[PDB]
Design a protein around this ligand. Structure first.
Ligand code: ANP
Ligand code: CA
Ligand code: CA
Ligand code: MG
Lengths: 152, 362
């Protein structure tokens, strides 16, 4: 099996990038994101990307999944912005929440031109980078209900 | 408006509704016709298996009988899910490296025959990776027709490193049929093959050390299992339990010269840029029914450890519901309005024809 004349011949193209960039324009959560240095946080709630109020940033429900965008000035230019995007997966989050957080992390990456570096942060396995965002990580019991309907 | 998600496997249809945690319809991808030389689909063909010869419209993940595939899809919509397809956007799936005409004809039939309002064709292994809650990893997807390796980084498959083998569950069933008949148990008809597939699913496993397990099986009966046939006769199977899926690691068992699944996985990682191999080695995600053998994750961990640098963290992820991971990933993505935004509409198909599938579905 070769790539030519196959369903993967258009992967990795400018066309793929254009299509996914356009799709990311249809998510209200990203409007105005990544415009200044700091940390922005959303939680997945029944497949939706819901902003977390600033006053609660750093507290995470163990039952839920989150997207954390860290905007910073890179070493290369003090007046430009660079990005780490962390998705945090609670020990008790459900499969719909973790999968939506993963897909929407890629989408936010697309929205910001591919510039964000992605980090998968499972509860209890958080990277030093993630820990460093809260110089104050607090884990809460509970979380919002799954968006899945359970097939009996 | 609820989207339909249909994962058309070579062996099993998995179909249902976006937003559900599992497919509501799972049934053999078969059309049956009288064994004495007009047709039945799926479970009703399986029900009349005594008088029917069973044909699979998909071989090695590619639709080879379009008339019968239309019967499968019609059955899925009207007889199993009991929906009107013109009322439902529909997500279909494909193995990577299929010829482009396969999804072109999928698109044509969905719009022109079933009049769906919108549709998308997704890469199966990408769906499985999202179902596992990851954007980076290497999926080993192994079903009834195709085994393939798809490395993915930050949500994008690496097409130059994708590997594919025509060795999968159907070949393992056939090999079990062959080696059981060599024990004295005749299984030959497409009907008896069904019994053998059930034996394979119930009793086979991957040995951690194949040579040692062969010696154990020849010394005592400690590895033997009984199996009751439909007529009530009880047969005993022994080293066939683990010789059958050993073929995945030693394709020469069925006369193939190709690499085993540990080697194709390693080779795929090795086709990726050096610095991301680390993340792939730590995120080998198993998907599909043929990855369900007890012992397969431990065996992959052992074999990949032997091939990889000694300092490399290796991890095999084996989700318990991985018979349905592809479908579940489809259910999640089809629940997202931004993913739906990329689907082909009927109006777009009317303007552009089948070629539009390559411009919209990635
Ligand atoms: N517990 C099990 N152990 C081993 N094999 C199994 C088990 N359960 C199912 N299988 C095999 O898995 C295959 C079906 O898996 P499935 O993932 O639904 O394939 P598919 O999607 O229909 N085919 P493909 O077109 O290759 O993706 C058949 O060969 C089954 O016999
Ligand atoms: Ca939750
Ligand atoms: Ca990026
Ligand atoms: Mg499959």
């Amino acid at each position: 099996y070769n790539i030519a004349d196959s369903n993967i011949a258009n992967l990795g193209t400018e066309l793929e990038k254009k299509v996914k960039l356009e799709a990311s324009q249809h998510e209200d959560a990203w409007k105005g994101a990544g415009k200044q240095v700091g940390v922005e946080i959303w939680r997945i709630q029944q497949f939706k990307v819901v902003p977390v109020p600033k006053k609660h940033h750093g507290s995470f429900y163990t039952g839920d999944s989150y997207i954390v965008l860290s905007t910073y000035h890179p070493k290369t230019n003090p007046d430009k912005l660079a990005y780490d995007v962390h998705f945090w997966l609670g020990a008790f989050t459900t499969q719909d929440e973790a999968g939506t957080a993963a897909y929407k992390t890629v989408e936010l990456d697309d929205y910001l031109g591919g510039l964000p570096v992605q980090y998968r942060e499972v509860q209890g396995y958080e990277s030093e980078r993630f820990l460093s965002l809260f110089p104050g990580l607090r884990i809460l019991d509970g979380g919002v209900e799954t968006g899945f309907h359970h097939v009996e | 408006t609820t989207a339909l998600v249909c994962d058309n496997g070579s062996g099993l249809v998995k179909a249902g509704f976006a937003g559900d945690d599992a497919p509501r319809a799972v049934f053999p991808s078969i059309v049956g016709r009288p064994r004495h030389q007009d047709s039945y689909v799926g479970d009703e063909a399986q029900s009349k298996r005594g008088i029917l010869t069973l044909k699979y419209p998909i071989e090695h993940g590619i639709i080879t009988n379009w008339d019968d595939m239309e019967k499968i899809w019609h059955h899925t919509f009207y007889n199993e899910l009991r929906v009107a397809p013109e009322e439902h956007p529909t997500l279909l799936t494909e193995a990577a490296l299929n010829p482009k005409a396969n999804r072109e004809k999928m698109t044509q039939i969905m719009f022109e025959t079933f009049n769906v309002p919108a549709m998308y064709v997704a890469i199966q292994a990408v769906l499985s990776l999202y179902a596992s809650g990851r954007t980076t990893g290497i999926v080993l997807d192994s079903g009834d027709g195709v085994t393939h390796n798809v490395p993915i980084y930050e949500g994008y498959a690496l097409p130059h490193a994708i590997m594919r083998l025509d060795l999968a569950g159907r070949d393992l069933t056939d090999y079990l049929m062959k080696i059981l008949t060599e024990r004295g148990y005749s299984f030959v008809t497409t009907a008896e093959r069904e019994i053998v597939r059930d034996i394979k699913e119930k009793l086979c496993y991957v040995a951690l050390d194949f040579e040692n397990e062969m010696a154990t099986a020849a010394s005592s009966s400690s590895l033997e299992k009984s199996y009751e046939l439909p007529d009530g006769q009880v047969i005993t199977i022994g080293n066939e339990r683990f010789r059958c899926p050993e073929t995945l690691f030693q394709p020469s068992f069925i006369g193939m010269e190709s690499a085993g699944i540990h080697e194709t996985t390693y080779n795929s990682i090795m086709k990726c840029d050096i610095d991301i191999r680390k993340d792939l080695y730590a995120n080998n995600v198993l998907s599909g029914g043929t990855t369900m053998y007890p012992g397969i994750a431990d065996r992959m961990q052992k074999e990949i450890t032997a091939l990889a640098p000694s300092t490399m963290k290796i991890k095999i992820i084996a989700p318990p519901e991985r018979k349905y991971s592809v479908w579940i990933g489809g259910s999640i993505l089809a629940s997202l309005s931004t993913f739906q935004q990329m689907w082909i509409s009927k109006q777009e198909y009317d303007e552009a024809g089948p070629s539009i599938v390559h411009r919209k579905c990635f």
